[PDB]
Ligand binder design. Structure first.
Ligand SMILES: CO[C@H]1O[C@H](CO)[C@@H](S[C@H]2O[C@H](CO)[C@@H](SC)[C@H](O)[C@H]2O)[C@H](O)[C@H]1O
Ligand SMILES: OC[C@H]1O[C@H](S[C@H]2[C@H](O)[C@@H](O)[C@@H](S)O[C@@H]2CO)[C@H](O)[C@@H](O)[C@@H]1O
Ligand SMILES: OC[C@H]1O[C@H](S[C@H]2[C@H](O)[C@@H](O)[C@@H](S)O[C@@H]2CO)[C@H](O)[C@@H](O)[C@@H]1O
Ligand SMILES: [Ca+2]
Ligand SMILES: [Cl-]
Ligand SMILES: [Hg+2]
Length: 496
């Protein structure tokens, strides 16, 4: 459950948020495969309710009505084709499994669903599954409202309705089996693992029961006896009754402290400095490295949802975002997930975006295709952070230094730091309001390396900055605080 099952040498997964199956299949072949990306986390592939007020929000996909593979991203046919095509080029697929609940209890009854299935929230009727009134936790919840009123009581967090969503009775074998059969269909198609949505709102034991029913991965792409990769979404910043450690037995867990603290450090808030990152990882109170799935931002907190947080860095703060993502990709802690989003019109009232509901680019409800420009960026308001040179090259950097020890740390006692990974990679950051000029020991063999942040190695030359490492391992670095990207990264494969 802890092994990502990526093709050997690939160390990151990318969340292609709200992307259509056909677009992801193409992306795997023309980009993700050749550029060394390990996998793709897809939006929920199961049928959801249609929300017209507001107009098709991204969150309607977190209100399941059935387990039919029929959404705005595509149908079963297109989903199977995407999985097959991506697996054939060495890119895995990870499914966002929404299994804690169904649709909103106060939703209207009818066929206003992405595939035409009927449902009646009031009577707890889901014919397409099928689920009935006794497949839910209505009588199990003890709050006056029926919803989660306090996060200091583990019972109501797991047995009550999360934002009015009908809570499934996961202790029942009927429910456990229905969910397992849905997940097994996905595994048989070729999916490598799952992101278990709202794991915090389910009992660790119930999740384990579902996981014990899962088949081994498809032998057409995976070795015999391969178990699906599992990463549970558990928001734990401390101070609450539920802890991330309660879920360690099922598989990996999302470490939300990672992005919250990294963001604070890079923004230089609350007296934090980059020099403090020397003991980054478990030294900062994070879960064990082999149990964590790390990321700077996710689909929720980049727009104030989930636990939110003001320190969270997103594409909106591009310069700092690249620094944070670059640090994450270079550091050995955890398994890394890169975010890929779409842009929406923000409207801040009282320091909060009220347009955080806006769904993916669309033409009257139909999600727009991902167009690729001449400079390799995306059109139609798809941000495609995974295509930014600075990010794609750091994804490659992580592959090159996989398994290498954290080494040769240096800092100026403020916000200028540098470190290497064995004798295969080195990175230097300048997050101070003044210039950086030092001769650092890189731990790398002598020669001329291409900086992969400002450019690329093309043939026997570099398109960006060139760094010369003398015979003893030292190299002079000069980074201005006004530089577009205030950090340099060189590795064994960028050497001329
Ligand atoms: C899981 O959280 C994300 O999805 C939910 C569900 O779509 C929304 S809440 C959303 O739906 C509920 C239930 O119908 C109503 S009533 C409380 C609410 O007004 C809607 O916003 C959540 O915002 C997402 O983060
Ligand atoms: O609103 C949808 C989300 O609701 C909560 S996020 C929740 C967090 O878990 C708590 O630790 C504190 S920060 O309050 C937060 C806001 O209610 C669920 O955990 C999410 O999974 C869900 O998506
Ligand atoms: O590899 C494609 C391009 O990637 C980025 S452009 C990127 C920029 O770095 C970010 O700060 C904001 S402005 O988004 C931009 C994409 O719209 C490189 O800087 C480019 O040189 C490169 O062409
Ligand atoms: Ca629950
Ligand atoms: Cl997540
Ligand atoms: Hg419904």
């Amino acid at each position: 459950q802890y092994a990502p099952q990526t093709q050997s040498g690939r160390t990151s997964i990318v969340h292609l948020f709200e992307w259509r199956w056909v677009d992801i299949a193409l992306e795997c072949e023309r980009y993700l495969g050749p550029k060394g990306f390990g996998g793709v986390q897809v939006s929920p592939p199961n049928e959801n309710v249609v929300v017209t007020n507001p107009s098709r929000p991204w969150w309607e996909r977190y209100q399941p009505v059935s387990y039919k593979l029929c959404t705005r991203s595509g149908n079963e046919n297109e989903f199977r084709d995407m999985v097959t095509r991506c697996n054939n080029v060495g890119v895995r697929i990870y499914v966002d499994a929404v299994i804690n609940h169904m649709c909103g209890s106060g939703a209207a009854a009818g066929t206003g669903t992405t595939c035409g299935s009927y449902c009646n929230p009031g009577s707890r009727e889901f014919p397409a599954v099928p689920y009935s009134a006794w497949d839910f936790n209505d009588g199990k919840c003890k709050t006056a409202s029926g919803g989660i009123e306090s996060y200091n009581d583990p019972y109501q967090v797991r047995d009550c309705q999360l934002v009015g969503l009908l809570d499934l009775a996961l202790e029942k074998d009927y429910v456990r089996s229905m969910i397992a059969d849905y997940l097994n269909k996905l595994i048989d198609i070729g999916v490598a693992g799952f992101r278990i949505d709202a794991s915090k709102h389910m009992w660790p034991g119930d999740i384990k029961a579902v996981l014990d029913k899962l088949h081994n991965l498809n032998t057409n792409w995976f070795p015999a006896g391969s178990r699906p990769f599992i990463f549970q979404e558990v928001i734990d910043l401390g101070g609450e009754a539920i802890k991330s450690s309660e879920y360690f037995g099922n598989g990996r867990v999302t470490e939300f402290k990672y992005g919250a603290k990294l963001g604070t450090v890079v923004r230089k808030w609350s007296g934090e400095k980059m020099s403090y990152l020397k003991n980054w990882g478990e030294g900062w109170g994070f879960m064990p490295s082999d149990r964590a799935l790390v990321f700077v931002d996710n689909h929720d907190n980049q727009r104030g949802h989930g636990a939110g947080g003001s320190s969270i860095l997103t594409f909106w703060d591009a310069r700092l975002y690249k620094i944070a993502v670059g640090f994450m990709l270079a550091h050995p802690y955890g398994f890394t997930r890169v975010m890929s989003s779409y842009r929406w019109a923000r409207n801040f009232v009282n320091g909060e975006d009220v347009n955080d509901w806006i769904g993916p680019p669309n033409n009257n409800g139909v999600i727009k295709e991902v167009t690729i420009n001449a400079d390799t960026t995306c059109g139609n308001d798809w941000v495609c952070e995974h295509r930014w040179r600075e990010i794609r090259n750091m994804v490659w950097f992580r592959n090159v230094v996989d398994g290498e020890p954290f080494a040769n740390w240096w800092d100026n006692g403020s916000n200028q730091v540098a470190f290497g990974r064995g004798n295969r990679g080195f990175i230097v950051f300048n997050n101070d309001d003044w210039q950086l000029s030092s001769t650092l020991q890189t731990g790398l063999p002598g020669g001329t390396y291409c900086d992969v942040i400002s450019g690329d190695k093309v043939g026997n030359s570099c398109t960006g900055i060139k760094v010369y490492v003398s015979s003893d391992g030292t190299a002079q670095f000069s980074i201005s605080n006004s530089a577009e990207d205030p950090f340099i990264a060189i590795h064994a494969e960028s050497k001329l």
